[PDB]
Paper text:
CtfA contains the acetate binding site and the PS01723 signature sequence.
Similar to other CoA transferases, acetyl-CoA is bound in an apparent high-affinity binding site in CtfB with most interactions occurring between the phospho-ADP of CoA and CtfB residues far from the acetate binding pocket. The adenosine base of acetyl-CoA is wedged between the methyl group of CtfB A146 (chain C) on one side and CtfB L158, I117, and L104 on the other side, shown in Figure 5. M121 extends the hydrophobic patch deeper into the binding site to make hydrophobic contacts with one methyl group of the pantothenic portion of CoA. Interestingly, even with the acetyl-CoA group bound, there are two acetate molecules in the acetate-binding site.
Author numbering:
A (entry chain A), C (entry chain D): 1 to 213
B (entry chain B), D (entry chain C): 2 to 215
The structure:
């Protein structure tokens, strides 16, 4: 079955894992999964997410306990500890424009080999990218981003693992659900099959491997 | 009050029916001065069309925030969505206006607003997508950084985009980047043209019908 | 006011227009808009769609009345009249793998310059495509598809033009809504704002220009 | 009967919990023969996970069809979605099995199944994406076309994909394409090995544990 005790994170999230973690500044983030990673000091992580939240919450807890070797994110400005580790050189930070980050994760999830975006052209983001012109306009070729495990947060799952989200807690979660090899969803409520309509489900249960909370 | 001056004038630029995105900080004040006869809708990059004002105490929802994680309301008819859809709206030409803060703008209309090497390194977030994709980009920014001009001949700080922004509004001036360079369109009632020029390093073209406002 | 009488289609769709039309074999297709085009002989059209449905319905009616100069579709096998006009040379047919069609329309809607897909590599679809290798795997560069007007079908619109879809009638409609310059939505019901929740709307009213019933 | 033979054997290949897509024609018969203990979920490219059998008369819904526009039911827990999401499931590796019809399969495991020049020109639809992206591709076809072998050294009809399909099931044979060529794993109880090889233009590797079944 899909629902597992939170201790199962230790079997599924390896030391050194590459992880996609949902949440925008900690909103819609799998807090209980993060707390278990902290409890067992699972480190050397590469975390792909919008941001490193704040020092006191979400992904910021992972940075505070020095569990990330690398973050691939669009924003770190609300976490001075992330910036301090970056400047000291103990944390590698790869900054990705937020829209590009979404499309790069999505490309991995939907089976594309890359996307062309005008975002970042002529900025430092262009460094080490293939530039492709189409119809006289320049685009950066941006490449799919893969991960071992997606750690996502959802409002409800039905008995089959179909997920719905709530308001601005959706953000990166359904995109990362498609893109990682294994998907673990932290959910606030389990509801009967038939409570979530075919027209409203946003992540089908077939792609959700494990559920906690 | 310089921030209020800017926010009031930017709000007067907005048109009925527009979808508008406000950056955190100074641009967020714009929402407090929308002319009563003007209806716009606000988008936040973290995934909402239909952002409303901060909730009354006790009406907060943990899952409903702006792009700074501050609690917001959602107005009737709002839509929330994932980050791919969000930047599809932003990058795809569906956002009428973005109002963003600024560190420098130059005579090419190029904006630098996400990094000062050796000083502030927050990352770009959605700013590069917003400047690249919005139908109209308005930069809302004080005219100088403690006296140092921010409207310069060529940006020395990292660029957010090579797209030419459409309007600069400061507490002293309203400027429109054009193919000939920066066109000064208005100056503040509380300043003078001489002061504006003393505090602008970039070359400015002067409109014939220079106005007073902000 | 977005809602207009259906008889205004002749004012909004020009001869020679490039149109995206929603629907999978006529399911989720704007049948009343199609009937207006037929009634007013709006001809020389280029139609981007999954298919040309059947001779008796949907996009098939446009082909039956010889109103298309060109179709850009993934499938024509259920319409022998499309096949006959293709063979006789009076209708140009551009076949696009269905998943590629979805992503090429999407790319125009979300501001990408193109996408890389493995679909079609080493087939006749590779002809006249740039081939890009990424991590030793070959992809076809597929380019955004633009249109003058999207003619989409939806289940309900609220007073603000927010749209929801129903079951397998969704197909290409919300993608096309993002991609065309002007968007006309045929809907079955207009409902009060607040009937469609923020968590279930699939197309925001801000991108819908006109609505017909 | 040969179509029943094939559909029964293909059904036996499906595993508990898999997401399966059945092409039009012979593969759709597979749903008639799923062993009773085996629970799978079906995807249709037009935008559903959770396809069910045709509705009882009077229970049809005009918005709920398969990829031939025939009325289907949706089972509890189904999800419907747009065509981009649909081909994200298909191209993205989230579909466990696709069962597709065949015109030819060759010694490289390449499938031709969407066009016969000068005859059948339906377009490819989703077939190229399905062969390219499914975790496992099973080709369910008759062994010959009115006596002409369909399992050939090199396809002469237009390829659907350069992906190597994973299994071929005919009324005579079960064949697994491998790096070494085509491995004949089983033959029908109603044929002989020699009859199978005589009706196959491709070279076959005969498994040392050849089995009888389908
Ligand atoms: C958004 C952003 C561009 C500006 O922020 P803002 O809220 O929109 O507007 P502000 O005028 O308050 O600018 C923020 C700070 O950056 C500083 N700053 C602004 N432009 C600068 C420049 N060109 N060089 C150095 N510092 C600069 C300001 O002095 C201000 O400093 P302070 O608040 O600590 O006293 C940042 O990025
Ligand atoms: C590939 C596809 C066309 C096969 O259809 P199917 O229902 O799954 O299986 P079938 O054996 O009935 O093949 C359908 C037709 O294609 C023909 N066909 C199949 N393989 C062929 C080949 N290699 N060359 C020519 N015709 C071929 C069959 O003879 C059959 O012809 P018919 O309709 O006149 O009887 C599907 O789509």
């Amino acid at each position: 079955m899909k629902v597992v005790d939170i201790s199962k994170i230790n079997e599924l999230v390896k030391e050194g894992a590459t992880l996609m973690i949902g949440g925008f500044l900690g909103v819609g983030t799998p807090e209980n999964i993060i707390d278990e990673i902290i409890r067992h000091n699972i480190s050397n992580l590469t975390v792909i997410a919008n941001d490193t939240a704040f020092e006191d919450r979400g992904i910021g807890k992972l940075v505070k306990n020095k569990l990330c070797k690398k973050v691939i994110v669009s924003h770190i400005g609300t976490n001075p500890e992330t910036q301090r580790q970056m400047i000291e050189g103990t944390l590698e930070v790869e900054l990705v424009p937020q829209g590009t980050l979404a499309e790069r994760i999505r490309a991995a999830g939907v089976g594309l080999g890359g996307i062309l975006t005008p975002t970042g052209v002529g900025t430092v983001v262009e460094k080490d990218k293939k530039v492709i012109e189409v119809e006289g306009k320049k685009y950066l070729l941006e490449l799919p981003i893969h991960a071992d495990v997606a750690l996502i947060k959802a409002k409800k799952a039905d008995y089959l693992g179909n997920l719905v989200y709530n308001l601005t807690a959706e953000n990166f979660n359904p995109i990362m659900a498609l893109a990682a090899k294994t998907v673990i969803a932290e959910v606030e409520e389990i509801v009967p099959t038939g409570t979530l309509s075919p027209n409203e489900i946003k992540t089908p249960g077939i792609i959700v491997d494990y559920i906690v909370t | 009050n310089p921030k209020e001056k800017i926010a009031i004038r930017v709000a007067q630029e907005l048109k009925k029916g527009q979808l508008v995105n406000l950056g955190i900080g100074l641009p967020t004040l714009v929402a407090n001065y929308i002319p009563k006869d003007i209806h716009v809708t606000f988008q936040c990059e973290n995934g909402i069309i239909g952002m409303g004002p901060a909730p009354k105490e006790g009406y907060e929802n943990s899952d409903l925030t702006n792009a700074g994680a501050s609690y917001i309301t959602a107005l009737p008819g709002a839509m929330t969505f994932d980050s791919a859809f969000s930047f599809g709206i932003i990058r795809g030409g569906h956002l009428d206006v973005t109002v963003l803060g600024g560190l420098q703008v130059d005579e090419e209309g190029h904006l630098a607003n996400w990094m000062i090497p050796g000083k502030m390194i927050p990352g770009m977030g959605g700013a590069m997508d917003l400047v690249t994709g919005a139908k109209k980009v308005i930069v809302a920014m004080t005219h100088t950084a403690k006296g140092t001009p921010k409207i310069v001949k060529k940006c020395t700080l990292p660029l957010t985009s090579i797209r030419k922004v459409d309007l600069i509004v400061t507490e002293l001036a309203v400027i429109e980047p054009t193919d000939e360079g920066l066109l000064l369109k208005e100056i503040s009632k509380e300043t003078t043209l001489d002061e504006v020029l003393k505090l602008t390093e970039a070359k400015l073209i002067i409109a014939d019908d220079l106005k007073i406002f902000a």
